[PDB]
Design an enzyme around this catalytic site. Structure first.
Site, PDB file in Angstrom:
ATOM      1  N   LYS B 290     -76.307 -66.544  36.624  1.00 46.17           N
ATOM      2  CA  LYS B 290     -76.664 -66.069  37.955  1.00 46.17           C
ATOM      3  C   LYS B 290     -77.919 -65.195  37.875  1.00 46.17           C
ATOM      4  O   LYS B 290     -77.970 -64.233  37.102  1.00 46.17           O
ATOM      5  CB  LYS B 290     -75.505 -65.284  38.583  1.00 46.17           C
ATOM      6  N   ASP B 295     -80.192 -57.800  44.858  1.00 47.45           N
ATOM      7  CA  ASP B 295     -79.196 -58.163  45.859  1.00 47.45           C
ATOM      8  C   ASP B 295     -79.071 -57.015  46.859  1.00 47.45           C
ATOM      9  O   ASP B 295     -78.333 -56.050  46.626  1.00 47.45           O
ATOM     10  CB  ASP B 295     -77.848 -58.468  45.200  1.00 47.45           C
ATOM     11  N   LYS B 302     -75.782 -54.124  52.063  1.00 46.52           N
ATOM     12  CA  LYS B 302     -74.939 -53.218  51.278  1.00 46.52           C
ATOM     13  C   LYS B 302     -75.118 -51.799  51.796  1.00 46.52           C
ATOM     14  O   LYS B 302     -75.865 -50.993  51.242  1.00 46.52           O
ATOM     15  CB  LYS B 302     -75.294 -53.294  49.804  1.00 46.52           C
ATOM     16  N   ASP B 310     -78.369 -49.375  44.847  1.00 39.86           N
ATOM     17  CA  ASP B 310     -79.399 -48.887  43.933  1.00 39.86           C
ATOM     18  C   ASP B 310     -79.296 -49.488  42.542  1.00 39.86           C
ATOM     19  O   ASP B 310     -80.243 -49.367  41.762  1.00 39.86           O
ATOM     20  CB  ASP B 310     -79.358 -47.361  43.857  1.00 39.86           C
ATOM     21  N   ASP B 315     -78.231 -57.741  39.168  1.00 39.55           N
ATOM     22  CA  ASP B 315     -77.583 -58.971  39.612  1.00 39.55           C
ATOM     23  C   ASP B 315     -78.169 -60.236  38.979  1.00 39.55           C
ATOM     24  O   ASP B 315     -77.734 -61.337  39.324  1.00 39.55           O
ATOM     25  CB  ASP B 315     -77.638 -59.067  41.133  1.00 39.55           C
ATOM     26  N   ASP B 375     -73.869 -61.613  51.667  1.00 37.58           N
ATOM     27  CA  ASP B 375     -73.722 -60.895  50.405  1.00 37.58           C
ATOM     28  C   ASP B 375     -72.836 -61.634  49.409  1.00 37.58           C
ATOM     29  O   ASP B 375     -72.626 -61.121  48.310  1.00 37.58           O
ATOM     30  CB  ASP B 375     -73.157 -59.484  50.662  1.00 37.58           C
ATOM     31  N   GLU B 377     -73.841 -64.291  48.027  1.00 35.37           N
ATOM     32  CA  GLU B 377     -74.970 -65.196  47.818  1.00 35.37           C
ATOM     33  C   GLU B 377     -74.949 -65.823  46.429  1.00 35.37           C
ATOM     34  O   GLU B 377     -75.497 -66.917  46.244  1.00 35.37           O
ATOM     35  CB  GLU B 377     -76.303 -64.460  48.041  1.00 35.37           C
ATOM     36  N   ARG B 379     -72.559 -67.218  44.641  1.00 36.66           N
ATOM     37  CA  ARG B 379     -71.854 -68.496  44.567  1.00 36.66           C
ATOM     38  C   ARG B 379     -72.629 -69.611  45.265  1.00 36.66           C
ATOM     39  O   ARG B 379     -72.505 -70.779  44.880  1.00 36.66           O
ATOM     40  CB  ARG B 379     -70.425 -68.358  45.141  1.00 36.66           C
TER      41      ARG B 379
HETATM   42  O1  LIG Z   1     -67.668 -58.675  45.331  1.00 43.10           O
HETATM   43  C1  LIG Z   1     -68.177 -58.289  46.328  1.00 43.10           C
HETATM   44  C2  LIG Z   1     -67.281 -57.853  47.474  1.00 43.10           C
HETATM   45  N1  LIG Z   1     -67.358 -56.414  47.530  1.00 43.10           N
HETATM   46  C3  LIG Z   1     -66.679 -55.539  46.584  1.00 43.10           C
HETATM   47  C4  LIG Z   1     -65.308 -55.415  46.641  1.00 43.10           C
HETATM   48  C5  LIG Z   1     -64.644 -54.583  45.766  1.00 43.10           C
HETATM   49  C6  LIG Z   1     -65.366 -53.844  44.843  1.00 43.10           C
HETATM   50  C7  LIG Z   1     -66.749 -53.941  44.785  1.00 43.10           C
HETATM   51  C8  LIG Z   1     -67.407 -54.790  45.661  1.00 43.10           C
HETATM   52  N2  LIG Z   1     -69.625 -58.229  46.443  1.00 43.10           N
HETATM   53  C9  LIG Z   1     -70.449 -58.664  45.324  1.00 43.10           C
HETATM   54  C10 LIG Z   1     -71.829 -59.199  45.659  1.00 43.10           C
HETATM   55  O2  LIG Z   1     -72.526 -58.634  46.425  1.00 43.10           O
HETATM   56  N3  LIG Z   1     -72.304 -60.402  45.013  1.00 43.10           N
HETATM   57  O3  LIG Z   1     -73.596 -60.812  45.363  1.00 43.10           O
HETATM   58  C11 LIG Z   1     -70.466 -57.648  44.194  1.00 43.10           C
HETATM   59  C12 LIG Z   1     -70.345 -56.318  44.537  1.00 43.10           C
HETATM   60  C13 LIG Z   1     -70.341 -55.372  43.541  1.00 43.10           C
HETATM   61  C14 LIG Z   1     -70.493 -55.772  42.225  1.00 43.10           C
HETATM   62  C15 LIG Z   1     -70.398 -54.668  41.198  1.00 43.10           C
HETATM   63  C16 LIG Z   1     -70.980 -54.608  39.954  1.00 43.10           C
HETATM   64  C17 LIG Z   1     -70.742 -53.511  39.131  1.00 43.10           C
HETATM   65  F1  LIG Z   1     -71.341 -53.425  37.907  1.00 43.10           F
HETATM   66  C18 LIG Z   1     -69.874 -52.521  39.544  1.00 43.10           C
HETATM   67  F2  LIG Z   1     -69.596 -51.445  38.763  1.00 43.10           F
HETATM   68  C19 LIG Z   1     -69.256 -52.639  40.765  1.00 43.10           C
HETATM   69  F3  LIG Z   1     -68.422 -51.685  41.259  1.00 43.10           F
HETATM   70  C20 LIG Z   1     -69.526 -53.695  41.583  1.00 43.10           C
HETATM   71  C21 LIG Z   1     -70.588 -57.104  41.870  1.00 43.10           C
HETATM   72  C22 LIG Z   1     -70.593 -58.059  42.871  1.00 43.10           C
HETATM   73 ZN   LIG Z   2     -74.100 -60.125  47.139  1.00 38.67          ZN
HETATM   74 ZN   LIG Z   3     -75.095 -60.688  44.053  1.00 34.70          ZN
END
Ligand SMILES: O=C(CNc1ccccc1)N[C@@H](C(=O)NO)c1ccc(-c2cc(F)c(F)c(F)c2)cc1
Ligand SMILES: [Zn+2]
Ligand SMILES: [Zn+2]
Ligand SMILES: O=C(CNc1ccccc1)N[C@@H](C(=O)NO)c1ccc(-c2cc(F)c(F)c(F)c2)cc1
Ligand SMILES: O=C(CNc1ccccc1)N[C@@H](C(=O)NO)c1ccc(-c2cc(F)c(F)c(F)c2)cc1
Ligand code: NA
Ligand code: NA
Ligand SMILES: [Zn+2]
Ligand SMILES: [Zn+2]
Ligand SMILES: [Zn+2]
Ligand SMILES: [Zn+2]
Lengths: 519, 525, 522
Positions: B290, B295, B302, B310, B315, B375, B377, B379
């Site tokens: 990925k 992001d 966010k 921050d 990502d 968000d 994105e 997948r």
């Molecule tokens: O999973 C979601 C849905 N929200 C969510 C739910 C419960 C807890 C945290 C986020 N959103 C993703 C995203 O935005 N993907 O694009 C996402 C968001 C955060 C991190 C990450 C990385 C780290 F290193 C962390 F320490 C951490 F806390 C979170 C990874 C992917």
């Molecule tokens: Zn995202």
């Molecule tokens: Zn992401």
């Protein structure tokens, strides 16, 4: 027609629209119950109630022209089943000609006069019997009392709920979905109901057309592609049309509407369709629909829990209702009326180019407006559309808009709210609500709140400083842009989307058409 | 390779990358401990435990070829010190040649077999002894039992933690930081460990290279400069490479990946590097990382408390692991394999041009997708990358991605999660986890949740209507883009960033390389 | 039996319990499918799939002994219907003797092998038909292939979903009548026959657990729940003991007692024992979390999504242990002694409640710094686990609605299992397989243990920094098991059926299979 801008070549450049739906191929035949029912191919469903007897037994009263089917439907066999609203049963048997037939019933409860909500539940049960069963014909026998408007609503609702929108399916189309080719209806005094059939088919498509535009996501349905669709609709119906682009909007000084669209990659497009009767025009009407093809909120971004930014493709539901009404009016050709169908279409986005909270903008009637929240964008676009509408010199202006989320806390998901400056016009809307069976409730414009729209710097604030009754505050704001014309405002924010079924309702098409027709 | 667009002339147009690091200048020698330890210069550290005796005393087992140092290290002088894991002491003395030397120990506890977590604690204590002390040489004496993989892990971890990334320091570089030039290691059966040294050095740099890309901020590390960096790496390694730009991505109909990038000032760049062994290719593997260089969340910005916008330069950690693997594989040159290193690189931004919540977009396999949250994105970009990978006709597809924050609530910051459609492949990943000492835990793809991705209008929903187990739902979604190939998915969202040390881990480089190497070698060896 | 305290005279003083249910009156008959189907009586439903044709047409193969029904079942008629999983149609018709019968099908998809989740969908479709049915017999014809455990799962799920809990209604259904006969046609019918009465026992264990969970906290409080456990033990001839506050103080259970300080209901510790007639070769303690209402305490459940209105279910673990006690007391396994334990209490807000920050002392002498009064379950379990290990058992298995993080790791379908002993974990996973209650093994990651290091007490109750709360809670519990194989099943995510607004009774069947099959038997 204008070219839709694309970011990448895979971005769509039009809204896919189905005009020739499977509902349009269904041949409808209405028969009088006095001649008895013939029970042959397909599925034959009896609509049965039992007044005053809650969950009372099923009894079939109609004459059936088959001895085998008549024996199956005798009271002794039917009394084991009850009329509980929405309950249904299927029956299998051989008729007098040794052919197997399928028969059944839908329970209509114990209250002789069904509300629109009750009738919708009846229709939904019927539709479940149509799905997952390859039938060539449905026959419906009315053993309940319905007036002409409620009979039409039954047909409209049946057609609408049965139709499945597959425009955005590619690999997941329903390989078993087959539609009946014939619909039979048995009813007492059938000759008096027959004129409702083709009216129902028109109302169904105006409503389903609105739903197609609403359900189309904002990458497909944007200000350019939505106004292009309006042009094609006008061409198909021989309506006059004018789409005003940015240069003309600047000349008209539409600063409130133009500011909302500043942040979008899609140029603003103002839709003006016109239907004019061939004879002497006795009434002129402007119908105004809110047309925000996506509402992000702008810099006041929809980021709060429960703000449902993912559903905001539906923020042009008002425009869709007005365009669906144009379909119905252009098809039915009422006399003695001239109707303008208006929508100030744009998209509310976040950009270096967007308008800001705090900006002071100038509407086309010269009023300066202090923007307090960029997510109150609908009333800004409507303000300029109402000034435009009043310059047309009409007798009535009616706007319809997904304006305020507060509608869910006041009337909820079933009834729209109507506000206005003229009781006679409000009463006409309420009468149209009764005959369209789209419910509306009159809500007040409370003048005491107007002082909370006083701005320290501009002529007026966009939003209130203190009052949380936002649907009322929004109506007070809009009222400032109609000077001397009877005007009503229908807030459909709560009723536009069917959350249980995850699809639009097309709310307002039939309400507005009944309003035009009954005038 | 492509010009990096700038808003102002001060915007950087490349990622600074250090290839020739101070670690590469360290001359390493391994000696057998049975010959005794010479204590001549620098710092000499004994790794000491006391099996079965909690906080037991320090006792030095090794022969020391110096009478003065041998006298200092008597049990009687060592008895005030204990072996508590991570404790250390420093000693000063003159040797037989009347030169001052520094000697000490790091306690390795009382449990004979150290875990990866324990061994890292030992390494961190050692590194504190190297910091703030101008030494020319370190010598490490293993008076503990470690197998070959754990010894390699020791060196990789030592190299990685010792290295300090100063690429973005200008007025605040550490004026006192000096690196040792020599590392001596005394160990039993030294000849069997000598081959691990240069393997550790390769694994160190693959991991540090990944760390460099991750820690590089999103103004430095964007889709253009990251793919430019991958070309430069391929050229140095003599890998075949191809970068697909927007016009080619449009022709391949990658509408899911392209929609994510619509709002960015940086054009999408799809990285495809390839290693092929000379001779017969017995296994073809696609590694998919990925690669979201920043992001923001998009219109689903966010903005909620705790969303860590921050830190979202991290990502592209999945892409970074895949490129670090390419360094290791391209350097070690395994036989019998063809490896494709893939990343659909883009940036998720807010703009008039961005894709919107609710948009219906079409993936390159023809599936229409209803976007429920901009968000989610990652997948979407992986869906098109997986379609691309399967079209290569490989035996295995393994993707690695900072996919779901839910990993922090399931496995936390230590263990990555692996999901997949093939038990044999999952077991190979678990075996690679064991030999790389990068921990992963197998999590299920629960098919009962698949119906919550059913869309009213599109073929499929991007996100679930009701299930909060987002790591599993995301895996169900990705599975829809793999038709008939063994596939595994490693969610590293929780393990990628070292929150305590405020730096990347480079997680996954060694896992994936061990995966490739163990497959390149027949099980009979 | 202790007296239930009341605030007003209208407060209930017992949990209503139905033991004799309509399911117990259903006569079940299993017939081999190779001989053809008798369809002259009642409602006959065919379970049909179509491999090789996705959502393809329905085709019925069985010969039936009625000319009218055979015509209905002709290929030309049934091809109008499709096999999409859970889809169903049924029709009423007259048989050769002019008696009313109903015939139909439930679609079973296109994948020959059904999961437990698929079988639940099939059963729900069947139950929808039954809740509108008044014919006295249902016949189910398996034209699909199911193994013995999954056939038993079919019966249990059918019984459980068919049964409607009307204890708190003040009226009574005009739309159905419970069947008096269930017929099943299946290949190898003789081997499936032994599953019938086991399914009936497993059904009631699950339904009994469901009744306790669904009973609201004004009905189901620490006194009335322990009174119900005594009544169950008496009906099953189990040995029983309820420990009250004075005994709990003597046992120094300061963690468990602290949680209950704010309640008007005295703490009650449930200890039932099943002992086999023969030699005891294995001793097992089953420990269920029994919080009859979880308000959160001073750490009140006020955050969005904290679901305080559902927290009567925080005694689902205790309910699973008591339902298991019903099944074990009924099936009477050999060579085992089973202790069914629950430290029951209520977590309330009061001048008398424990506070965030309080340091309390568990019964093994460990002092605990309370970081959050809403992490109360692990405190009650700590003392329950010390009590369990003093019994000198071979295995301790606890089951608990412990951590909301389960919803984000495994979700609402699979429970998580943690433990200190791989063999016991593998035994639980096998019981999951044969009970068809899904569980997944999750790790106890020792690197997180240091976050429970307290500045002042021996240990912290919660981590300040690690968000993997299910693992941290397991690390905490592990400190109260010194030298016994132990497993911990976190059912916080799977215990309540949100769609149907009712409990699942999750865990009764899992634990009973563990107890029945724990000890190998040759
Ligand atoms: O999973 C979601 C849905 N929200 C969510 C739910 C419960 C807890 C945290 C986020 N959103 C993703 C995203 O935005 N993907 O694009 C996402 C968001 C955060 C991190 C990450 C990385 C780290 F290193 C962390 F320490 C951490 F806390 C979170 C990874 C992917
Ligand atoms: Zn995202
Ligand atoms: Zn992401
Ligand atoms: O009214 C406001 C701000 N206050 C407010 C928002 C939400 C709830 C209560 C008060 N914002 C409007 C807007 O953004 N106008 O442009 C808006 C916001 C939401 C919906 C809507 C539509 C639906 F179908 C819903 F089910 C629903 F919950 C909300 C419509 C308009
Ligand atoms: O774990 C925590 C810490 N907070 C938290 C952390 C991460 C995510 C969510 C909450 N709090 C627990 C508690 O308070 N225990 O006393 C708790 C909270 C909720 C449910 C539950 C039970 C159910 F049956 C459900 F269906 C359900 F959705 C949630 C169980 C335990
Ligand atoms: Na739309
Ligand atoms: Na309860
Ligand atoms: Zn809006
Ligand atoms: Zn808005
Ligand atoms: Zn709690
Ligand atoms: Zn609790």
């Amino acid at each position: 027609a204008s070219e839709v801008p694309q970011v990448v070549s895979l971005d769509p450049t039009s809204i896919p629209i189905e005009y020739n739906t499977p509902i349009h191929d269904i041949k409808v035949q209405v028969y009088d119950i006095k001649g008895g029912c013939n029970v042959e191919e397909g599925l034959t469903i009896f609509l049965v109630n039992n007044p005053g007897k809650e969950n009372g037994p099923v009894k079939i009263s109609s004459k059936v022209n088959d001895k085998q089917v008549s024996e199956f439907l005798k009271d002794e066999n039917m009394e084991k089943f009850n009329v509980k609203l929405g309950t249904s049963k299927h029956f299998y048997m051989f008729n007098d000609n040794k052919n197997s037939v399928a028969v059944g019933y839908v329970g209509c409860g114990s209250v002789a006069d069904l509300s629109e909500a009750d009738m919708k539940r009846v229709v939904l049960s019927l539709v479940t019997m149509l799905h997952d069963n390859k039938l060539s014909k449905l026959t419906v026998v009315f053993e309940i009392n319905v007036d002409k408007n409620l009979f039409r609503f039954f047909l409209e609702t049946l057609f609408y709920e049965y139709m499945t929108d597959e425009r955005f399916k590619s690999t997941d189309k329903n390989v078993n979905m087959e539609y009946i080719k014939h619909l039979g209806v048995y009813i007492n005094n059938a000759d008096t109901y027959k004129e409702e059939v083709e009216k129902a088919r028109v109302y169904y498509f105006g409503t389903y057309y609105a739903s197609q535009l609403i359900a189309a996501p904002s990458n497909y349905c944007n200000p350019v592609s939505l106004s292009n669709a309006a042009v094609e609709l006008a061409q198909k119906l021989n309506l006059e049309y004018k789409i005003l682009g940015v240069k003309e909007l600047e000349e008209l000084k539409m600063g409130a509407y133009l500011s909302v669209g500043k942040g979008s990659m899609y140029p603003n497009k103002f839709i003006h369709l016109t239907y004019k009767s061939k004879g002497d025009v006795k009434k002129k009407i402007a119908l105004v629909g809110k047309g925000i093809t996506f509402d992000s909120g702008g810099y006041n971004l929809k980021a709060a829990p429960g703000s449902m930014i993912d559903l905001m493709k539906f923020d042009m539901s008002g425009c869709a209702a007005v365009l669906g009404c144009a379909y119905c009016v252009g098809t039915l050709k009422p006399e003695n009326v001239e109707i303008h169908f208006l929508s100030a279409v744009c998209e509310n986005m976040v950009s270096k180019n967007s308008y800001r909270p705090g900006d002071i903008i100038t509407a086309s009637n010269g009023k300066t407006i202090e923007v307090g929240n960029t997510d109150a964008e609908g009333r800004l676009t409507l303000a300029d559309a109402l000034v435009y509408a009043e310059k047309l010199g009409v007798d009535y202006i009616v706007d319809i808009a997904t304006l305020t989320g507060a509608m869910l806390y006041s009337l909820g998901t079933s009834y729209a709210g109507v506000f206005g400056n003229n009781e006679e016009l409000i009463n006409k809307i309420l009468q149209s609500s009764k005959t369209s069976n789209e419910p509306v409730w009159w809500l007040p414009i409370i003048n005491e709140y107007r002082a909370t729209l006083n701005s320290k710097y501009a002529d007026i604030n966009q939003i209130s400083s203190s009052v949380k009754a936002s649907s009322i505050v929004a109506s007070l704001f809009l009222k400032e842009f109609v000077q001397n014309t009877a005007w009503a405002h229908i807030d459909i924010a709560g009723v536009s989307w069917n959350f249980k079924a995850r699809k639009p309702k097309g709310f307002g098409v039939r309400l507005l058409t009944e309003f035009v027709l009954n005038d």
